[PDB]
A paper describes a structure:
The primary function of HLA-E has been ascribed to presenting self-peptides to NK cells. Complexes of HLA-E and self-peptide serve as ligands for the inhibitory receptor NKG2A, ensuring that healthy cells presenting appropriate peptide ligands are protected from NK cell attack. We have previously demonstrated that the non-structural protein 13 (Nsp13) of SARS-CoV-2 contains the HLA-E-restricted Nsp13232-240 epitope VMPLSAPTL, which hinders binding of HLA-E/peptide complexes to the inhibitory NK cell receptor NKG2A. The Nsp13232-240 epitope is presented by HLA-E and position 2 serves as a main anchor for HLA-E-restricted peptides.
The ancestral sequence of the Nsp13232-240 epitope is efficiently presented by HLA-E but, in contrast to self-peptides, HLA-E/Nsp13232-240 complexes do not bind to the inhibitory receptor NKG2A. This absence of binding reduces inhibition, rendering target cells that present the viral peptide susceptible to attack by NKG2A+ NK cells. Consequently, excessive presentation of the Nsp13232-240 epitope without binding the NKG2A receptor reduces inhibition and facilitates activation, thereby rendering infected cells susceptible to attack by NK cells. Comparison of these high-resolution structures demonstrated that the conformations of the two epitopes were largely conserved. Conversely, the viral peptides VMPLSAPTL (BA.5) and VIPLSAPTL (BQ.1) share a serine at position 5 (p5S) and a threonine at position 8 (p8T), precluding direct interactions with NKG2A/CD94. Upon assessing the HLA-E presentation capacity of viral peptides in cellular presentation assays, we found that Nsp13232-240 from SARS-CoV-2 BA.5 - which is shared with ancestral SARS-CoV-2, SARS-CoV-1, and sarbecoviruses from wildlife—displayed the most pronounced HLA-E binding capacity, likely due to the presence of p2M. Surveying genomes of wildlife sarbecoviruses sampled over a period of 17 years, we found that 14 out of 15 viruses encode for the VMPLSAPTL epitope that is identical to the ancestral SARS-CoV-2 epitope. SARS-CoV-1, which caused an outbreak in humans between 2002 and 2004, is another virus closely related to SARS-CoV-2 and likewise encoded the VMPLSAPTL sequence.
Residue numbers in the entry:
A (entry chain B): 1 to 100
B (entry chain P): 1 to 9
C (entry chain A): 1 to 274
Amino acid sequence: MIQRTPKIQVYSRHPAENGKSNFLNCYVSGFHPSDIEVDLLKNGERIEKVEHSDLSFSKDWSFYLLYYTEFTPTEKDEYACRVNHVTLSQPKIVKWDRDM
Amino acid sequence: VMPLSAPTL
Amino acid sequence: GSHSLKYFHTSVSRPGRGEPRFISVGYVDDTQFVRFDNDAASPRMVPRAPWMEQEGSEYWDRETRSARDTAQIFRVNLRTLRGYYNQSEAGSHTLQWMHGCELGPDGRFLRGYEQFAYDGKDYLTLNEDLRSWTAVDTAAQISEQKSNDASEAEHQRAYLEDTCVEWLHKYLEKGKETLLHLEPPKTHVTHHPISDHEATLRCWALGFYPAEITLTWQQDGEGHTQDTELVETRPAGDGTFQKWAAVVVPSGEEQRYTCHVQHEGLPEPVTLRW
């Protein structure tokens, strides 16, 4: 009945410094139902082993999750988050922009 | 701690 | 200030893919401290904050029992609710349960709440007196009647006013070194031209705890600029939070804009400019 589309933010734990260790985060929120797949990509390829927070929800009942992995950013490497949710026409790719 | 009673609907 | 002990419970039916998935998470304020997830063999309530690691078997055994029993009751509830709404076994459905107690600044109970949602909407709510319920429709009216039969509000009132408050105080003591530490935001401004005529000013607040913050842009030292681009406050992943706010301004007019940050950890509000 009610389905709500995920909000997606892709970002680093600390402001990115090329060659320095960090965490890449994909925060998905505001969604219903709770079934969702969130994949972190490096140069188009899915990072096989990433971790996530425990499923929780806000006052309005909508769910949120954090997916995260260790990474060392460089100039040449592109990172993105891919989100698979029933509300989307196709999996949505959001690129990491180190200014957002 | 969580409640010791879970409501039946 | 005020403190809260809250839990968020979710059960989702997975037709022909096993039994419902059940997950419980507990928070003190903005800090998760426990979880239970039955998507696993021999599932247990487990610590999710360092200061809970010291808790003994008495605690984990009791909390696992409660979570397992809740999962079972939610399993049954999911079948019932399909019954009430004339839904087949084919679709997936969600039952959510949230509850919490809140202490005021004076360190005593101020408020308790409990609510249920089915398929992402209000179903059954505990009233402010903690002695009666509000039902959204004729199905929830049956659940209300079952609750009244079972004196369920009395059980939940005793948890909210007594147990929840007792344990919130315990947790605040156990985790005080972090839970009662205000971590102010580290703030900065970024500046990127968009065209010959316009530029983006972005105000960052990083590394702060608790999550509550106000970040605003002001034009000409009063009010807030309309159409400020805000993002939802987001987790850093280390127990702190991040947020930013951006405005698009005419080139050369950057000195008219100030970013204003309020946070419990700041002695006074911070004002930044480019």
